[PDB]
Amino acid sequence: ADIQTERAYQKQPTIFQNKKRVLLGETGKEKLPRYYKNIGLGFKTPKEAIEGTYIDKKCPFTGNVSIRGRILSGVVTKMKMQRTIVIRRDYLHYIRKYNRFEKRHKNMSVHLSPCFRDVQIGDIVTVGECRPLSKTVRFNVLKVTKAAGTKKQ
Amino acid sequence: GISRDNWHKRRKTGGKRKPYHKKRKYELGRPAANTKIGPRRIHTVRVRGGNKKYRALRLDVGNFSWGSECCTRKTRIIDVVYNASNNELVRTKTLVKNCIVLIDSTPYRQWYESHYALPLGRKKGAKLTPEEEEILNKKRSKKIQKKYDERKKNAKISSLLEEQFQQGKLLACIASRPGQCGRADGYVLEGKELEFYLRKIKARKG
Amino acid sequence: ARGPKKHLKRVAAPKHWMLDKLTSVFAPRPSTGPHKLRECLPLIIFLRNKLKYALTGDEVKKICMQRFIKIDGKVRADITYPAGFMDVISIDKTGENFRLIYDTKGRFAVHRITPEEAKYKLCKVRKIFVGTKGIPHLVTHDARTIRYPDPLIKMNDTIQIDLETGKITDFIKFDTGNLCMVTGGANLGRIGVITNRERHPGSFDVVHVKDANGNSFATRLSNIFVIGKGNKPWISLPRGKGIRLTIAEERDKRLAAKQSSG
RNA sequence: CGCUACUACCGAUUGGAUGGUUUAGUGAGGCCCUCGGAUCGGCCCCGCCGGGGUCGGCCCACGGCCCUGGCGGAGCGCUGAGAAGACGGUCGAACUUGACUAUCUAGAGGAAGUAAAAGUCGUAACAAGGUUUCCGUAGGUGAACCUGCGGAAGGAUCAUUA
RNA sequence: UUAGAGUGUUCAAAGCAGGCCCGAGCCGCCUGGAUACCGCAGCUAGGAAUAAUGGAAUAGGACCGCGGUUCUAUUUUGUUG
RNA sequence: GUGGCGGCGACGACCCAUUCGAACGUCUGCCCUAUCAACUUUCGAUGGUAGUCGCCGUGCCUACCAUGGUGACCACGGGUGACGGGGAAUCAGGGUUCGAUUCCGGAGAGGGAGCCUGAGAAACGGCUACCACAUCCAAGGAAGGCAGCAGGCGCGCAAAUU
RNA sequence: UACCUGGUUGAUCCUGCCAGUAGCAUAUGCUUGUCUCAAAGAUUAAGCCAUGCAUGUCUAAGUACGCACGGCCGGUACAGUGAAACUGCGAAUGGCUCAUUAAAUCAGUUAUGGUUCCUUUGGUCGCUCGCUCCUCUCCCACUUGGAUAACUGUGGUAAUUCUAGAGCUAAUACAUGCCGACGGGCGCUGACCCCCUUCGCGGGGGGGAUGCGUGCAUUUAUCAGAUCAAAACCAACCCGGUCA
RNA sequence: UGUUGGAACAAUGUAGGUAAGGGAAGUCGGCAAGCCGGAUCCGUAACUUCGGGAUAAGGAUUGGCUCUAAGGGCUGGGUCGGUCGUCGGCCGGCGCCUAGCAGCCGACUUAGAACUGGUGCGGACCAGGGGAAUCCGACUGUUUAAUUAAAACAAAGCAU
């Protein structure tokens, strides 16, 4: 195991792994060339998703999901079931009768880029809208945002 | 009677959704068109908004492609070997998208023996003498004899695919959805993903 | 609930049609022509109330069917044919020709124009749409898919079509120094130079506008419509020139002319 | 406490009446599929004429080859249309019986509360209410109550001279 | 619909109507049907007092400095290769 | 004795568009209840890979893995004599009560389920069964859905002229 | 219009409620002369239904031998009205009521790069290109097939918008299907032929008979989709102008 | 075949079985026999000394034949040159069984699927009828060998 987990064969569709026709100097070179599309709106494509060996179907930068419409943030809470995380999201609701606010919260699941270990919990993240990835997975993760207030360099 | 509803199953919050309407036309399902191997029998379906569907029940020829030579041909399926979804869909000889079949290698070998003029099948030396010697050699005053020599080199097929051509069957995934369109079209298997798929067939039995 | 809608009731219908409340219940439902409901003007209401040539539907029924009405060069034969921005309409029996552009409040003011301006029109584009066979295609406000345009045509532009064969002549590009009239929205029917377009990737691109009267406002890019070059409009404008006047200022004009024409 | 009326309660019937949700069994009906073959049209193996070319025929009686309108016997032989019906799947109303839950109700006998009028026994409390009152807990007595242990003064002393 | 502007429905409740000028000679004119309000949530842009929150403490900001590996091309005689 | 001739009605294809909308989604917003504190499941309960069905996106469905989602910021279960909203009554500033009611959106034709034609019905002034109530009958069979406009019955404190 | 009064007490102060006062929506009693607007089977029974109406459709521009009128008009067809009847469109809009339904519906806000859309309006609609039979039409395109309807004629049961059996008939109904688009074009195979030049093999440079496929969507796979700042090598000799 | 054989097949027995319809109407009394009866998967009340009640009750499945999936053991590490008899002891030089793969054996099991049978399938045998109450004794135990198996004696606990 310890490298990949699959029954079928996972690959980027756009790339064609079997271009290999020439024997000449090298039968195999810098192999299975990488596919990645950058999202707009200025979000920086992580270097991990460029030189990475992983294969994903719904990764924002290396899949087919199309981010649009709504962009929000959150505070990560759980690192449970693989390829998606659960984020609390605190906010204030205003009661009209009193002139006073009332705290609420609504926590939702979001997909992830499988590039990432080193995504701790309790840290802010910026999340974007997507096509309905699953029953409760709509929003998708674009870039995580907290490492300085943490441990050793 | 089946419906592709989202109002017949619980919320994420464990609660139960009491419906507020009875089943609706604009969201519907029909029994599976689980197509097997046999004489070409494709039976019709009408769907929402016109654009009538063609669903297949028994198929034998498909437009399988060879990705390493930019050529594709019609080809007579003869088997089914591996499906990553179900196991009971390889015994049944079903046909679905991404179902690894065995296609007839006759059109591709014939094409190879006519393109590069290098033999790709010899066990008894049965045939195949007259055409191949002719074509590589001079036929229009030394022009063609040059360009086939360019093709004598760099004619590639791996022993991962060489042995299949000798054996007459080519592992080939299906990439066209037989249930909805009706055509059993896909690509031949080669390279590393052939290697990965070869081992699974070798040691599927457990 | 089960299909299309085929009954539009009373003033639930758009407010700029200038309708009543005690003319029964329903209102004419435009025939789904070259404009949305909330931008068009039924041809029936242009013959009973805006013009007051007729009295009822019937006297309108017999006019349009007698084939005197001419819209965009080729006659129409439906009572409720949606009108829209920059549409030319002609009445050959009496001899007038109307332009039907927005007012400073938004009412589709009656606007009589000369036969020279009755030849062409101005239409905004929606997408440059190079299609099969390498053929460049356009689309306009009134759903004219023009093949083979000048390649410089990009977006938000204004075209001028002869109204016999389309065939755009004398286009004007969208720039940040040109006149433009706002269509749709609360700002409906003002005129001024653009002077800015502050982009917003992923949302409505807000376009500010400064008027020749010195005032300023802003809208979204969709509501902008270009009607000329520089500070020169290609078209004559009605009284007020599309320059909004505050209800205080409009009050002064009402009182002065009083007892001076009737 | 021979003193009635009303309100609510517990209660053996291991009770009744209605909904409502469901496990399970039976499962009519539509639809998908694998069969199906009442019957209805075309084809070709046959004969004869007339229409035109044709060998034997000067043209014709008639025959051989091809094509056509018509005439009939037979292979119903190869082909298209196709209902009745069936094995199977899917959805599944409804019935029968269980569980669950809800609101409403009959029930000997018992024990509460409220109002009753001019009832019988006592006098517990408010004045040091004639044992100072009250709280907690406990036992007993016809009844209010009495008493034991620790408190409170809402006590009848804001205090008593080393 | 609430508010409110203009208007003599005989007043008003209402309604978005109407006023001239003359036999009519114009082969009619002047106009109306506006505005404010519409939280909370979302978008936008100026203000940065108050209230959250952040930054280099076992090294971090600055100096277009002089060095390596590893690669992605534009185009110069090779027009292209 | 021929070849060319405009205006139109109707027509089908769709990278197509434009309109009419329709459908699953995104963020925030709901009345009373703790004598409802733990709820959700292999039978899809949150997710991953692959796939049949769908007009598509997705546990929508099947397989194979992973063990997960929500909850004291009120889930879950119950009640409403609750269709939601634009609005309505009352009022100094706050508010409290009401909204079936002619506009916008949703559900339905006695309770449920299934489906043909059609772009758009799970339509009921369309069909198929079952259930309850039922109208003709030669006893063999046939037909229906006034929560449309008028009407009558029953219901009631209470609601119009066939 | 930012409002208060009667009531525990021998008398007083106050907490507290009970009762007052006005609007509002339904019912109800009494009364009622005019006019202008105007609610009206919701509350309980989303319970029941007798009876009658509430969804039909024709233009010069799909079908025309009812003989139902009318042509004068019987001749190498079809005056014109024209009810039936086949076809297309319509019944999926309107109206009613609120039984369900508690992030469910609905409101404000957004994406549908995640789909379908009769009709209205704009666009294209020279689609491919390659057979012509026997000794005499391959094939119709200057028009290719049969089928039912109303109509005529026999009936059936007590009955319904119930239908069977028999004889004709049409198409914008169901089907079939053609030189013309007369492809000169284009790309792959591609008999070859021709020159420069290598004894020759060779390379360059040429033009090509044959045959296959033809942007009209659907399905699958593969390719390129920019190049933003530059000067030389070995080495093809190539686009070129300067004398050489 | 238990201290004998032969022939028949009457009644009464003794010991086994089944019976249409009704199902305790029989009788002092459901006395006797009769249903349930194993296992897998769901489901489980009043009461309570919170351990029990409990196999409570009440459901479904079970045959064959063909498959599928899962649950394990033993062994392993280089061409090169010379020496020693590219295989090996040695040297030096390399490999680095580097993600954990490769080869050989090995037992019975458990879950699922297809097909088939006159829907039969714990197919002989072995294998509980349940529920609601009352009286008595706490319980397990013991006794009247040869009519009384209990509500009788014992019993821990309590107390003189």
Curated annotation (Swiss-Prot), chain A:
Listed InterPro entries: NA-bd_OB-fold, Ribosomal_uS17, Ribosomal_uS17_arc/euk, Ribosomal_uS17_CS, Ribosomal_uS17_N
Protein localization: Cytoplasm; Nucleus, Nucleolus
Omega-N-methylarginine found at: R68
UniProt keyword terms in alphabetical order: Acetylation, Citrullination, Cytoplasm, Lipoprotein, Methylation, Nucleus, Palmitate, Phosphoprotein, Ribonucleoprotein, Ribosomal protein, RNA-binding, rRNA-binding
Entry comment on modification after translation: Citrullinated by PADI4.
Positions carrying N6-acetyllysine: K37, K44, K57
Classification via PROSITE patterns: RIBOSOMAL_S17
GO cellular component: cytosolic ribosome; cytosolic small ribosomal subunit; nucleolus
Modified residues (N-acetylalanine): A1
Assembly with partners or alone: Component of the small ribosomal subunit. Part of the small subunit (SSU) processome, composed of more than 70 proteins and the RNA chaperone small nucleolar RNA (snoRNA) U3.
Function: Component of the small ribosomal subunit. The ribosome is a large ribonucleoprotein complex responsible for the synthesis of proteins in the cell. Part of the small subunit (SSU) processome, first precursor of the small eukaryotic ribosomal subunit. During the assembly of the SSU processome in the nucleolus, many ribosome biogenesis factors, an RNA chaperone and ribosomal proteins associate with the nascent pre-rRNA and work in concert to generate RNA folding, modifications, rearrangements and cleavage as well as targeted degradation of pre-ribosomal RNA by the RNA exosome.
Protein name: Small ribosomal subunit protein uS17
Classification of source organism: Eukaryota, Metazoa, Chordata, Craniata, Vertebrata
Gene name, Swiss-Prot/TrEMBL: RPS11
Curated annotation (Swiss-Prot), chain B:
Stretches with biased composition (Basic residues): 7-25
Gene Ontology terms for molecular function: structural constituent of ribosome
PANTHER family with a match to the protein in the record: 40S RIBOSOMAL PROTEIN S8
Modified residues (N6-acetyllysine): K36, K127
Protein name from the UniProt record: Small ribosomal subunit protein eS8
Signal peptide feature range: none
GO biological processes: translation
Main location: cytoplasm
Gene (UniProt): RPS8
Positions of modified residues (Phosphothreonine): T129
InterPro entries: Ribosomal_eS8, Ribosomal_eS8_CS, Ribosomal_protein_eS8_euk, Ribosomal_Se8/biogenesis_NSA2
A single Gene Ontology CC term: cytosolic ribosome
Lipidation (N-myristoyl glycine): G1
Domain of life, per lineage: Eukaryota
Family in the record: Belongs to the eukaryotic ribosomal protein eS8 family.
Function: Component of the small ribosomal subunit. The ribosome is a large ribonucleoprotein complex responsible for the synthesis of proteins in the cell. Part of the small subunit (SSU) processome, first precursor of the small eukaryotic ribosomal subunit. During the assembly of the SSU processome in the nucleolus, many ribosome biogenesis factors, an RNA chaperone and ribosomal proteins associate with the nascent pre-rRNA and work in concert to generate RNA folding, modifications, rearrangements and cleavage as well as targeted degradation of pre-ribosomal RNA by the RNA exosome.
Subcellular location: Cytoplasm; Membrane; Nucleus, Nucleolus
Matches recorded under NCBIfam families: eS8
Record note on quaternary structure: Component of the small ribosomal subunit. Identified in a IGF2BP1-dependent mRNP granule complex containing untranslated mRNAs. Part of the small subunit (SSU) processome, composed of more than 70 proteins and the RNA chaperone small nucleolar RNA (snoRNA) U3.
Region annotation (Disordered) ranges: 1-26
Cross-link Glycyl lysine isopeptide (Lys-Gly) (interchain with G-Cter in SUMO2) mapped to chain: K169, K192
UniProtKB/Swiss-Prot annotation, chain C:
UniProt keyword annotations, A-Z: Acetylation, Cytoplasm, Isopeptide bond, Nucleus, Ribonucleoprotein, Ribosomal protein, RNA-binding, rRNA-binding, Ubl conjugation
SMART domains: S4
UniProt signal peptide: none
Cellular compartments annotated: Cytoplasm; Nucleus, Nucleolus
GO biological process: translation
GO (cellular component) term, any one: cytosolic small ribosomal subunit
Keyword Acetylation among UniProt keywords: yes
InterPro entries (alphabetical): KOW, Rib_uL2_dom2, Ribosomal_eS4, Ribosomal_eS4_C, Ribosomal_eS4_central_region, Ribosomal_eS4_central_sf, Ribosomal_eS4_KOW, Ribosomal_eS4_N
Ribonucleoprotein as UniProt keyword: yes
CDD domains linked to this entry: KOW_RPS4 (cd06087), S4 (cd00165)
Positions of modified residues (N6-acetyllysine): K232
Position(s), cross-link Glycyl lysine isopeptide (Lys-Gly) (interchain with G-Cter in SUMO2): K229
Main subcellular location: cytoplasm
Function: Component of the small ribosomal subunit. The ribosome is a large ribonucleoprotein complex responsible for the synthesis of proteins in the cell. Part of the small subunit (SSU) processome, first precursor of the small eukaryotic ribosomal subunit. During the assembly of the SSU processome in the nucleolus, many ribosome biogenesis factors, an RNA chaperone and ribosomal proteins associate with the nascent pre-rRNA and work in concert to generate RNA folding, modifications, rearrangements and cleavage as well as targeted degradation of pre-ribosomal RNA by the RNA exosome.
Family per similarity comment: Belongs to the eukaryotic ribosomal protein eS4 family.
Protein name: Small ribosomal subunit protein eS4
Organism: Oryctolagus cuniculus
